[PDB]
Design a binder for this molecule. Structure first.
Ligand SMILES: CC(=O)O[C@H]1C(=O)[C@@]2(C)[C@H]([C@H](OC(=O)c3ccccc3)[C@]3(O)C[C@H](OC(=O)[C@H](O)[C@@H](NC(=O)c4ccccc4)c4ccccc4)C(C)=C1C3(C)C)[C@]1(OC(C)=O)CO[C@@H]1C[C@@H]2O
Ligand SMILES: CC(=O)O[C@H]1C(=O)[C@@]2(C)[C@H]([C@H](OC(=O)c3ccccc3)[C@]3(O)C[C@H](OC(=O)[C@H](O)[C@@H](NC(=O)c4ccccc4)c4ccccc4)C(C)=C1C3(C)C)[C@]1(OC(C)=O)CO[C@@H]1C[C@@H]2O
Ligand SMILES: Nc1nc2c(ncn2[C@@H]2O[C@H](COP(=O)(O)OP(=O)(O)OP(=O)(O)O)[C@@H](O)[C@H]2O)c(=O)[nH]1
Ligand SMILES: Nc1nc2c(ncn2[C@@H]2O[C@H](COP(=O)(O)OP(=O)(O)O)[C@@H](O)[C@H]2O)c(=O)[nH]1
Ligand SMILES: Nc1nc2c(ncn2[C@@H]2O[C@H](COP(=O)(O)OP(=O)(O)O)[C@@H](O)[C@H]2O)c(=O)[nH]1
Ligand SMILES: [Mg+2]
Lengths: 441, 429, 429
């Protein structure tokens, strides 16, 4: 059984998961009290709730997910909220003080106190698995728990397990919008485990999502609640071919084999094409051809980036619903035709399609309309180096005067560790300079 | 979890906190008697941040009232909110402080601090997981300055890792009502440097200026100016008590407000401030609130930010608001005024957003600024200090009480060195 | 056939057994008055293991209640279950034990044991074919320790081949509520070595730990901890009373639990333990129950098995279950944890499976472990013992009562020798 583990770390990581685990409840037809209603005398792990829901006896569905925070407060929104009996009580693990936007606290001081209780929750879910697929860590670069704790966990998960996929859904720091002033300190130090221990790190940021809500979608005034329904459709499609039938299904490992060229070049941005408001959903031509072109739009990116500034290295089409493939292959051949889209010269064969039959669900009270087709495009590009150049420069400014150093050293790390994680990220950005360039003879 | 011990000290300390626990006691629907009369269960989830629940749903604060004079205590007891405190927390001597620093820090303070730290340990031994402390006091008083800094310098020996912050009132030369308030303020600035995690510098002139210009009051008393200040102190720890979209404890501010140690002197700010009548004529929004927070005339510190650069600010909003408008307004500011910000720090602003506004309006906000323009405070005092001290005026009331000269000269130099700490961090790239 | 005589002794002994015969009296549908009100004829086939049927279908246990103090007896009589015992089985003196071993074993115990062994022979002469006995008592009391070991050492002279086991409560250093409980526990460990067939060592801290962590209780009393223990004591002799797929008497365990004589100190364990509310979130299965029975946090002995090796365990399941899952889970454990088992014994586990779960759930289990990690118990006592005894503290209350020193030094050496018996059988190949 294609089972998978969600881990939701820190405030952002929890609050996304609300929007994730809201959705799968609708995907598989599960009430917030974990119950499938009486109109499901059909196949359950044939609808495959069984990758995200261990079926407790007597028709009751509880996730394979763990909600971890060093602060009591965030998860207590999940107790009560409405999800107060969706969740297993013992998978909502609270500390007492958060890391408090301090990586040294989340990794050394506070994080170690709950790390074995969290790893022991993993084992209770790891031993219930048959054919474990991997882990889905949600967090934000630029928290304390999202960076400090996640770094501590990913070390421990690499040692105990090794073999499985470990996906990350990070939130990257936005170039203008920031709310912590040590936001770059906590991102340089999370660099270390993100490239080493994760197998595939995704990056999103809030500004590139603000664009999409306002422009494609005509929402006046987004909150976090609005953005995360969007986030969840990207992840919901990723992991949909594990757990629904379709031609050209794609396991969690078939991404990495088809998306990731080299060891540490594993930072693909996602997109999602049918972001359409209810009114604008008529006056649609929302065919396969239009929605494939919309993925390659530099405006429909989930990262403050412009793929016109770098070259794609792989793409990866994950479609849901009313789909005929030859429409897709004719839309690929258009994509290969255009010269505004630069692939690299060592790719040649562009990219991997995958289709699934299960159409998305419209989240109730949600921002999308009812679409028939839908497409994430996970896509390696050399344009995500530009996100890094804009953030190293913020780190290099503050660390030039050794600003907030006294908070960090007095918590269980060294001054020396800044100089290693800065070199570490400077080498990544040098890898993408050398991976964009073809070789000639 | 995350309890706050309140040590209101001196005369001024007690007046503010009197009005402070009239606001908090409204935030959580506490009766004057001490019963609960709310409706929403948000008011109780985090009541324990300030209040010990006692037997039979009465709610006793965790506040300790310190004085060297029986008077303020008898006033508070006999008032509307006497009932609310525990009577073992009204700790007071008999002989007055003299508005003398030496008398409150060495002679008559040391005698009493034993009977007060024993009350600190009643409170600290009852908490689940303490976060922090707080003085409310006055740089320019006897007990506010002297006894306050004796309490502080004896808590760092006991509780060396809790966020200890002060809401300290600082003197202004335009409004003087004590002759030796330079002597009393110099010798306590010396103690606040090495001992405190955050310091919210508040003045008097800055509070009339809010009353006259913004609020359109006529005739302000201490009663009115501290009613403002208490609306700031409520704002600080809102996300500690209420759920929010961004949270922010005491520690969260501290961490990214304070570049270097020692530079922990903040300038608060509140918005909105309207007169009654002129409330149906302001539309209440986020661009409306942001423009007041970057206004000079809504600083509770009698300075103009334009005489320096904000190192860092924090913006604590309270209300059902958006995040784009917040993230944008806080962006459009540090672009249009990029010469008013220190440029070696990207994103000088930290936002926090609670969900719970004050109990009369929607969408308040609270500005807390680490500006370099606060050396304007420290120099206006160290000019009065050095003008009296060159004559050695009023000296025998100080050397009489256990002090000597060398405590002065060093304390003058510790104030004049941190003028050269705001100065370094204003200019030089 | 296969009757069990119950000798609950002391204060603690009576409290457990009070709650013990509230469970058994529910297993067989016994009314508080003593009539039968069951529905299934399984409840009666083997009722006689515990109950004498008396005239007119009333069911009187075979329990004898011993005390040196009238109080516990008057409590039990006046309670819900006073009616159930025979009034000739409430055997008690007047003068209290002193929480003194000498006073319960020599002076005031010997006076009474004649009037109690005469009650043992009322019970033993009425049985068809007796199997065993049982104390319920406390190592650390006066009557539980002293009088218990006088009763035991006088039954081996009468009934020298019946399985005599104890459910003895052993002291823990984290929770002390008696000053000389080392004196009282040392002198009774000495008697349990040479005289007993099985000994179920139970602690206090291990029972809070189950209440707090597993069961999610708030406020445990003796009432709650012994309610657990009685669910263990029911499990022991389940297959003696109910039909099963594997059966297992007292004797069946004894035989293949105990490698060498003298090493008859077992660690119980119960599973499942959930809070209410957290029951619809555990799926109840044989791998679910197995993981609880081998986790350290579900030991009713305040030790960690990881500080040694299980010599042998037994696994007593109660419910409509499979045999493959049982035979597999019990296999997958002693493969994955092969360094946690003594390797000179193949198949450290004995399974027994009954058909009858407790009267609220399906598929319970009971873990009974012969671990080498139990020397952690005997050393924590023999450190307190040797720290008081080097001063000869509290000595005159013992030498006053017919004892002398040489009973101590030998009894200290008999405890310290079997520390070197668990030690030998942990290590050395
Ligand atoms: C009809 C109506 O809506 O009345 C308003 C009102 O007219 C205004 C003018 C109020 C009023 O405030 C003042 O006039 C004032 C007096 C002394 C010090 C500071 C202000 C108000 O008195 C104050 C009062 O504030 C609250 O209830 C807050 O929860 C506030 N509470 C207190 O300070 C307090 C007041 C009285 C009794 C107990 C507590 C608060 C703020 C921060 C942190 C905690 C609590 C409100 C909304 C009003 C009145 C009543 C007229 C304003 O102030 C505040 C802090 O809300 C002044 O500018 C705002 C805008 C409001 O619209
Ligand atoms: C819906 C459901 O399944 O409810 C269970 C239940 O929730 C649990 C939590 C029960 C429950 O136990 C307690 O809450 C409790 C309170 C104080 C002290 C000790 C226990 C239960 O009350 C107790 C009760 O036990 C029995 O009925 C057994 O026959 C038990 N009997 C008694 O001890 C007993 C209790 C009250 C009056 C008379 C007798 C037993 C166990 C082993 C051997 C012989 C008998 C059970 C299964 C339940 C409830 C009812 C909620 C648990 O306890 C026992 C001894 O089974 C606590 O951990 C277990 C796991 C159970 O699943
Ligand atoms: N999508 C999304 N992103 C968020 C949310 N909350 C915060 N983020 C971002 O993630 C970072 C903050 O992580 P925090 O919540 O501050 O920290 P944490 O990792 O939970 O731990 P603490 O610092 O101890 O509070 C910032 O840079 C934000 O811009 C949320 O609800 N949704
Ligand atoms: N903000 C504020 N300051 C006060 C108040 N009362 C006194 N002060 C200040 O406190 C100092 C005098 O100390 P005081 O409190 O009289 O000392 P006491 O002898 O302990 O009462 C001066 O610097 C005043 O500006 C008050 O009600 N509010
Ligand atoms: N488990 C348990 N132990 C008990 C109880 N009551 C007393 N004890 C223990 O017994 C010892 C005191 O012996 P006690 O039973 O009072 O002897 P008495 O004079 O014969 O009553 C202490 O070591 C206690 O831990 C009980 O109800 N349960
Ligand atoms: Mg947080």
């Amino acid at each position: 059984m294609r089972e998978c583990i969600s881990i939701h770390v820190g405030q952002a990581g929890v609050q996304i998961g609300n929007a994730c685990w809201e959705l799968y409840c609708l995907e598989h037809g599960i009430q917030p009290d974990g119950q499938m209603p009486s109109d499901k005398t059909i196949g359950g792990g044939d609808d495959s709730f069984n990758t995200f829901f261990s079926e407790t006896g007597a028709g009751k569905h509880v996730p394979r997910a763990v909600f971890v925070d060093l602060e009591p407060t965030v998860i207590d929104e999940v107790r009560t909220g409405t999800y107060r009996q969706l969740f297993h009580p013992e998978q909502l693990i609270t500390g007492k003080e958060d890391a408090a936007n301090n990586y040294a606290r989340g990794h050394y001081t506070i994080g170690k106190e709950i790390i074995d209780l969290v790893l022991d929750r993993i084992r209770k879910l790891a031993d219930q698995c048959t054919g474990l697929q991997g882990f889905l860590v949600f967090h934000s670069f630029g928290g304390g728990t999202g960076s400090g704790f996640t770094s501590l966990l990913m070390e421990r998960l690499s040692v105990d397990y090794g073999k499985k996929s470990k996906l990350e859904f990070s939130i990257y720091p936005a170039p203008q919008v920031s709310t912590a002033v040590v936001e770059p300190y906590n991102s340089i130090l999370t660099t270390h485990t993100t490239l080493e221990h994760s197998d595939c790190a995704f990056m999103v940021d809030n500004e590139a999502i603000y664009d999409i809500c306002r422009r494609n979608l005509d929402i006046e005034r987004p909150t976090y609640t609005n953005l995360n329904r969007l986030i969840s459709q990207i992840v919901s499609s990723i992991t949909a071919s594990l757990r629904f039938d379709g031609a050209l299904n794609v396991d969690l490992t078939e991404f990495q084999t088809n998306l990731v060229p080299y060891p540490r070049i594993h930072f693909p941005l996602a997109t999602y094409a049918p972001v359409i408001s209810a009114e604008k959903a008529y006056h649609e031509q929302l065919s396969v051809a239009e929605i494939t072109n919309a993925c390659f739009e530099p405006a429909n990116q989930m990262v403050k980036c412009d793929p016109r500034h770098g070259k794609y290295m792989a793409c990866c089409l994950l479609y849901r619903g009313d789909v005929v493939p030859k429409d897709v292959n004719a839309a690929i051949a258009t994509i290969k035709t255009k010269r505004s889209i630069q692939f690299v010269d060592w790719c040649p064969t562009g990219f991997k399609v995958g289709i699934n039959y299960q159409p998305p669900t419209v989240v109730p009270g949600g921002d999308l309309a009812k679409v028939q087709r839908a497409v994430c495009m996970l896509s390696n590009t050399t344009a995500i180096a530009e996100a890094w150049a804009r953030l190293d420069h913020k780190f290099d400014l503050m660390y030039a005067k050794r600003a907030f150093v006294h908070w960090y050293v007095g918590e269980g790390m060294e001054e020396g560790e800044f100089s290693e994680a800065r070199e570490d990220m400077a080498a990544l950005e040098k890898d993408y300079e050398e991976v964009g360039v073809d070789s000639v003879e | 979890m995350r309890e706050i011990v309140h040590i209101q000290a001196g005369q001024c300390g007690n007046q503010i906190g009197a009005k402070f626990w009239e606001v908090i006691s409204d935030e959580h629907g506490i009766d004057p008697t001490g019963s609960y009369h709310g409706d929403s269960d948000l008011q109780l989830e985090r009541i324990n941040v300030y209040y010990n629940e006692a037997t039979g749903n009465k709610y006793v604060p965790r506040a300790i009232l310190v004085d060297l004079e029986p008077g303020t205590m008898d006033s508070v007891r006999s008032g509307p909110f006497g009932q609310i405190f525990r009577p073992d927390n009204f700790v007071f001597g008999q002989s007055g402080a003299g508005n003398n620093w030496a008398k409150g820090h060495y002679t008559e303070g040391a005698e009493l601090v034993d009977s007060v730290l024993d009350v600190v340990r009643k409170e600290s031994e009852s908490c689940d997981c303490l976060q922090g402390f707080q003085l409310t006091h006055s740089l320019g008083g006897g007990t506010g300055s002297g006894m306050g800094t004796l309490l502080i310098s004896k808590i760092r020996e006991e509780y060396p890792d809790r966020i200890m912050n002060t809401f300290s009132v600082m003197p202004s030369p335009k409004v003087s009502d004590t002759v030796v308030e330079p002597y009393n303020a110099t010798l306590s600035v010396h103690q606040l440097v090495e001992n405190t995690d955050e310091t919210y510098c508040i003045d008097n002139e800055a509070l009339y200026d809010i009353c006259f210009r913004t609020l359109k009051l006529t005739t302000p008393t201490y009663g009115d100016l501290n009613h403002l200040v208490s609306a700031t102190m409520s704002g600080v720890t809102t996300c500690l008590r209420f759920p929010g979209q961004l949270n922010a404890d005491l520690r969260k501010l501290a961490v990214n407000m304070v570049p270097f140690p020692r530079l922990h002197f903040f300038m608060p700010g509140f918005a909105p401030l309207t007169s009654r009548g002129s409330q149906q004529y302001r539309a209440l929004t986020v661009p409306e609130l942001t423009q007041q927070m970057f206004d000079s005339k809504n600083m509770m510190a009698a300075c103009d930010p334009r005489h320096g650069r904000y190192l860092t600010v924090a913006a604590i909003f309270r209300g059902r608001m958006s995040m784009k408008e917040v993230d944008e307004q806080m962006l459009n500011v540090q672009n249009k005024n990029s010469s008013y910000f220190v440029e070696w720090i990207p994103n000088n602003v930290k936002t926090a957003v609670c969900d719970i506004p004050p109990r009369g309006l929607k969408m308040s906000a609270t500005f807390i600024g680490n500006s370099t323009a606060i050396q304007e405070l420290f120099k206006r005092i160290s000019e009065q200090f050095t003008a009296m001290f060159r004559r050695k005026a009023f000296l025998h009331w100080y050397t009489g009480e256990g002090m000597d000269e060398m405590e002065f000269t060093e304390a003058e130099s510790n104030m004049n060195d941190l003028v050269s700490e705001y100065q370094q961090y204003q200019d030089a790239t």
